[PDB]
Structure 1
Amino acid sequence: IVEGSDAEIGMSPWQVMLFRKSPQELLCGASLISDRWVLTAAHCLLYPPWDKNFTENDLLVRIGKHSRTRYERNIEKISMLEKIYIHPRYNWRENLDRDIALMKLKKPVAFSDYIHPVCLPDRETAASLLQAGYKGRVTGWGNLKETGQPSVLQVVNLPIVERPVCKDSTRIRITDNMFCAGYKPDEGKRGDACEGDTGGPFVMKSPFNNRWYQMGIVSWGEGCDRDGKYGFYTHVFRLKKWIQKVIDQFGE
């Protein structure tokens, strides 16, 4: 996260770290949506141009963390993966369209003050909150700048940007399964997700029921926190039917 600040303890209890087992490395952010389901970006798991195709046994998640490096005894939980599911129409060849994946945990994680699932949006919450100028929150342990790494979970709030401004900001073809967020050049404020934050959640707090909803997944950008550039996010609500299908079928 570029130009954010230290999270408070328990401020993002759905935050998940995705690791490669060996060698030990933080790959990506992710999010807890139930006791056995974790949401991330497809490119975190599958990216053929980099010969990236992780199986269940390659990977591990850590839940409940605040410090990036320090072991948080009887707070953090480590979970193995049972199964990975990538969206069937995930498009790595052009623009990362439908950049979404679900990972099923080998055993359910116990909820605590530090471990707790985020809501997925219904149609009214999507209609109400996903509007240009409205701010959501991005969190992660990724790089502090485009070049390093924070000692503690970082957080930044970012406004959703009007689609024509998103479209004009990049030569890459953008789709309805994406949105973009970040401050404009003349707005003064700064902030972005960066390398290592991808796959993590873009969340918004409902004023109607005080719940946090995950509206986006950190997907792609051109650099981090450049003037007149914006972060792109998988549009979670647009892909809700796939998420439901996977959970309802394979949550046995």
Structure 2
Amino acid sequence: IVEGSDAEIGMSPWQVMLFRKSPQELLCGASLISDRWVLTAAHCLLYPPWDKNFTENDLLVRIGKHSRTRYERNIEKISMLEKIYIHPRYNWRENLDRDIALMKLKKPVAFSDYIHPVCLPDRETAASLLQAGYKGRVTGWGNLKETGQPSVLQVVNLPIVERPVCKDSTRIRITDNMFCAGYKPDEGKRGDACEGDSGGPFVMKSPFNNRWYQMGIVSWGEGCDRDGKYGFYTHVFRLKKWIQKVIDQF
């Protein structure tokens, strides 16, 4: 996360860290939505241009973390995966459309003051909150600059941007399954997610019922925090029917 701050303890109890077993490295962010399911971006796992095609046995999911590099004994939990599901229509070939993947944990995790799931939005919440100008929050242990990595979880609050503006900031084709967020050069505020933050959650807090809903998944962006560019996020609600299907079928 670029131009963000250190999160507070228990600020994002649904944040998950996808860790590789060999080498042992931070792969991406993800979120806990159930005691058994984790949501992430599909390019964190499959991205053929760079030969990434990770399987269950190559990953560990660490939940309850704050510190990036330390094993927070008695606080964090590490789970193994049973299955990984990538959206059958994830478009890695062109613009990472439907960049979403679900992972089933081997065993349920128990909630604590540092581990708790985030809610997934319903048509109404999506409608009233996914409006340009409204701010969401992204969290992660990814790069701090484009070209180092933080000691603890970082947070940055960014506004959603009007679709026309997103389309006009790039050559890439934006679909209705994505939304963009970030500040305009003439706003005087910065911030963005960066490499290492993909897969993590873009959440908003409902003013009606005070719950945090995950509206997006950090997907791509051209560089990190460049002026005139924005970060793109997978639109969770548009892909919720797929999410449901996988969870009440497997």
Scaled by the length of structure 2, the TM-score of the pair is 0.99
Gap regions ≥5 residues in structure 2 = none
Please state how far the C-alpha of 1:72 moved relative to its aligned partner: 1.3
Please state how far the C-alpha of 1:119 moved relative to its aligned partner: 0.1
- Residues 183-205 of structure 1 show CA distances to partners (whole Å, capped at 9, x for unaligned) of 00000000000010011000000
Please state how far the C-alpha of 1:71 moved relative to its aligned partner: 2.0
Structure 1: distance between partners of 2:229 and 2:51:
28
* Cross-structure match for 1:54: 54
Structure 2: distance between partners of 1:175 and 1:45:
21
More moved, 44-53 vs 206-215: 44-53
Tell me the secondary structure at the aligned position of residue 92 of structure 2. Answer: coil
- Residues 81-129 of structure 1 show CA distances to partners (whole Å, capped at 9, x for unaligned) of 0000000100001000000000000000000000000000001000000
Structure 1: distance between partners of 2:171 and 2:49:
20
Is 1:23 the equivalent of 2:8?
no
Q: Percent of aligned positions with the same letter in both sequences?
A: 100
* Cross-structure match for 2:144: 144
Structure 1: distance between partners of 2:20 and 2:113:
26
Structure 2: distance between partners of 1:59 and 1:197:
16
Gap regions ≥5 residues in structure 1 = none
Structure 2: distance between partners of 1:110 and 1:249:
23
Tell me the secondary structure at the aligned position of residue 74 of structure 1. Answer: coil
- Residues 24-75 of structure 1 show CA distances to partners (whole Å, capped at 9, x for unaligned) of 0100000000000000000011111111111110111100001111221111
Structure 2: distance between partners of 1:127 and 1:160:
13
Which 4+ runs in 1 deviate beyond 2 A?
none
- Residues 132-173 of structure 1 show CA distances to partners (whole Å, capped at 9, x for unaligned) of 000000000000110001001000000000000000000011
Q: Over aligned residues, Cα RMSD in angstroms?
A: 0.5
More moved, 103-112 vs 44-53: 44-53
Structure 2: distance between partners of 1:52 and 1:231:
22
Aligned length: 250
* Cross-structure match for 2:70: 70
Scaled by the length of structure 1, the TM-score of the pair is 0.99
